[PDB]
UniProtKB/Swiss-Prot annotation:
Note describing how the cofactor binds: Binds 1 [4Fe-4S] cluster. The cluster is coordinated with 3 cysteines and an exchangeable S-adenosyl-L-methionine.
Annotated PROSITE patterns: RADICAL_SAM
Protein name (record): [FeFe] hydrogenase maturase subunit HydE
Subunit-level organization: Monomer.
Family classification: Belongs to the radical SAM superfamily. HydE family.
Keyword Metal-binding: yes
Organism name: Thermotoga maritima (strain ATCC 43589 / DSM 3109 / JCM 10099 / NBRC 100826 / MSB8)
Pfam families per record: Radical_SAM
Residue ranges constituting the Radical SAM core domain according to the UniProt record: 49-268
Binding residue positions for [2Fe-2S] cluster: 311, 319, 322
Family matches, as InterPro entries: Aldolase_TIM, BATS_dom, Elp3/MiaA/NifB-like_rSAM, FeFe-hyd_HydE_rSAM, HydE/PylB-like, rSAM
Highest classification ranks of the organism: Bacteria, Thermotogati, Thermotogota, Thermotogae, Thermotogales
GO biological process: sulfur compound biosynthetic process; water-soluble vitamin biosynthetic process
Binding site residues for [4Fe-4S] cluster: 63, 67, 70
């Protein structure tokens, strides 16, 4: 079908593989703009004008895994490794709550040191502050996930990365798509609000792969979906590969919103890294969440999944104020509660 016809099918929610492929393959400006408007309007209708702030503390860059894309991979010897103490992490969380954060995200490499009990202790302390806690710690045994839920954790982010099992295993040689999915299913069973999502523009990833990523997200009806471009890192095997395209990645965000109209979708830091102002554009094309960097110096600059990240030269407390200004200049509002998913049951 033509652009106008694909848009009509999207508006009528005829989400066939062919409609999603054609939406991702058409490069016409008018079509893309209309797709972006559609996603923006669906966002406003379902999740409103509140942009939810998730303050992220990247508390350790130690990792046991060796993912080919990631600057924290275990084989990268050209990176100073760091670990925040549990006291530092709690007090840094308390500062974010003082600054108005209503969710604290704890993210790390897969660092065995904390697992599971030091994380449980931290979570319990942060939960006393009356905020949501989200974990993004990678793949762990069911048992660990269960202990963290009992400790009070509310949400868990585990991007599925790529729904192509062959590409997944090549890029993540310690593990598999099956394992990743099983972790995601376990987290949902345990009562977490669960986040998935993928990178766009991975080496070897095709448009058909991106369609499969959308259908996977739609299948499992995730609470949150984190999408960004692949950004090559010079101390990795994928150093010389092409970066993911911003517009294609933005279309993935827009389609995610159309497919999952009541979901929580961030404007990721990676989007703001590859294009100046990329988060702001993404917030106008389907996204409704922002995750300001709350990692303190001198560690912030050592948490380099990809290079050139924005927010590295700012002061320790700048990023929450910075996103509150962004939200205002976008004519949006800050989140009034924890920003949990508010499901709209349909037919
Ligand atoms: C309307 C005014 C004045 C002529 C012109 C001057 C510079 C133009 C923007 C830039 O070209 C960057 C970008 C290119 C895309 O292609 C279309 C979108 C965008 C934002 C453009 C929109 C518009 O066209 C602008 C504001
Ligand atoms: C700001 C620019 C330039 C527009 C422009 O230059 N016009 C503004 C003022 C001109 N006036 C209206 C005052 C009168 C025109 C008389 S004049 O004499 O200037 O031609 C317009 C041009 C194309 C617009 C984007 C696309 O839609 C896609 C998408 C839709 C979403 O939903 C919201 C996000 C997004 C990215 C849009 C944002 C923004 O909105 C853009 C960049
Ligand atoms: C942390 C310190 C010291 C006092 C303190 O420890 N304050 C705890 C407040 C706890 N809460 C945020 C939950 C209050 C909600 C009140 S509210 O009426 O907003 O619901 C206080 C003193 C002045 C406060 C800033 C200014 O105000 C301007 C601005 C208002 C925004 O809005 C949030 C961001 C920002 C930058 C504020 C952040 C933080 O807060 C500051 C630095
Ligand atoms: C100006 C920069 C490139 C900067 C650079 O690196 N030089 C390029 C890179 C990505 C481009 C946007 C995306 O295409 C999405 C969207 C399509 C709409 O049609 C028009 C508006 C909008 C926001 C585009 C505007 C502009 O064109 C951008 C920011
Ligand atoms: C302190 C820094 C400078 C400024 C820049 C933008 C400001 C925020 C926005 O204005 C939106 C909003 C309006 C409400 O009135 C009060 C709350 C809030 C979150 C503002 C707080 C504070 O004032 C900010 C962070
Ligand atoms: N080079 C790169 N470009 C863009 N995103 C990257 C990247 N390297 C890693 N990421 C993204 O960063 C996310 C957080 S990684 C930290 C969390 C945890 N270890 C985990 O793997 O889940 C990953 O899910 C991945 O999608
Ligand atoms: O873009 C980034 O740098 C981060 C990586 S994970 C987080 C998300 O939850 O989407 N975004
Ligand atoms: S993506 Fe997560 S698990 Fe993979 S190397 Fe990076 S930090 Fe470790
Ligand atoms: Cl969250
Ligand atoms: S920041």
């Amino acid at each position: 079908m033509t652009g106008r016809e694909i848009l009509e099918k999207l508006e009528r929610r005829e989400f066939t593989r062919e409609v999603l492929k054609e939406a991702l393959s058409i490069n016409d400006r008018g079509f893309n703009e209309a797709l972006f408007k559609l996603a923006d309007e669906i966002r406003r209708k379902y999740v409103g004008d509140e942009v939810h702030i998730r303050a992220i503390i990247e508390f350790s860059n130690v990792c046991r895994k060796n993912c080919l894309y990631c600057g924290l991979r275990r084989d990268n010897k050209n990176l100073k490794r760091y670990r925040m103490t549990p006291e530092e992490i709690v007090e840094r969380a308390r500062l974010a709550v003082q600054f108005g954060a209503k969710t604290i995200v704890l993210q790390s490499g897969e660092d065995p040191y904390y697992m599971p009990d030091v994380i449980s202790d931290i979570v319990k302390e942060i939960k006393k502050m009356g905020v949501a806690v989200t974990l993004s710690l990678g793949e762990w045994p069911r048992e660990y996930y269960e202990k963290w839920k009992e400790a009070g954790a509310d949400r868990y982010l585990l991007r599925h990365e790529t729904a192509n099992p062959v590409l997944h295993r090549k890029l993540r040689p310690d593990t598999s798509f099956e394992n990743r999915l099983n972790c995601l299913l376990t987290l949902k069973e345990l009562g977490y609000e669960t986040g998935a999502g993928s990178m766009v523009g991975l080496p070897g990833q095709t448009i058909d792969d991106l369609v499969d990523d959308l259908l996977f997200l739609k299948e499992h009806d995730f609470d949150m979906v984190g999408i960004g471009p692949f950004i090559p890192h010079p101390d990795t095997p994928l150093a010389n590969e092409k970066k993911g395209d911003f517009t294609l990645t933005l279309k993935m965000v827009a389609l995610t919103r159309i497919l999952l109209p009541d979901s929580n979708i961030p404007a990721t830091t990676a989007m703001g890294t590859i294009v100046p102002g990329g988060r702001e554009i993404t917030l106008r094309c389907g996204a409704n969440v922002i995750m300001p960097n709350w990692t303190p110096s001198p560690y912030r600059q050592l948490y380099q999944l990809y290079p050139g990240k924005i927010c590295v030269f700012e002061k320790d407390t700048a990023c929450i104020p910075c996103v509150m200004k962004m939200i205002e200049l976008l004519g949006r509002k800050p989140g009034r509660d924890w920003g949990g998913r508010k499901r709209v049951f349909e037919t």
